Amino acid sequence: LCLDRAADFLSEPMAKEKQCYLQQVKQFCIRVENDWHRVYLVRKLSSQRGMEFVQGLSKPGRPHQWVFPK
């Protein structure tokens, strides 16, 4: 549910609360060392906004690259 909330936040085309939440979620995905969390985040973001937006995030110079596995 947390990853779903984060994906809905990142799907928005963000005032001191969603930013802190996404930062905490990034720290969590970095710390827990689990690929499945990032996988589910990617899958939800895709189901929300097509795989084209996901692949666009996959490009260099993007602020949402941690969503992808290593």
Partner 1 sequence: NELLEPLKNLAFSPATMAHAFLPTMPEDLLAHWYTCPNGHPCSCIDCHAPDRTQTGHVLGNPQRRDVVTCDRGLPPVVFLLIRLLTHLALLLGASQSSQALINIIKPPVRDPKGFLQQHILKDLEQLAKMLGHSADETIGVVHLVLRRLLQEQTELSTKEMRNNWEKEIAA
Q: Which residue in the set 27, 47, 55, 65 belongs to the binding site for partner 1 (CB under 8 A)? A: 47
Q: Which residue in the set 30, 36, 50, 56 belongs to the binding site for partner 1 (CB under 8 A)? A: 50
The token duo for 10 is 């990142």
Question: Cβ 50 to partner 1, closest distance in Å?
Answer: 5
Rounded alpha-carbon distances, angstroms, from residue 5 to 48, 59, 61: 12, 23, 24
**Contacting residues for 59 by C-beta, under 8 A, at least 6 apart:** none
Q: Which residue in the set 18, 28, 37, 46 belongs to the binding site for partner 1 (CB under 8 A)? A: 46
Binding site for partner 1 (CB under 8 A): 46-51
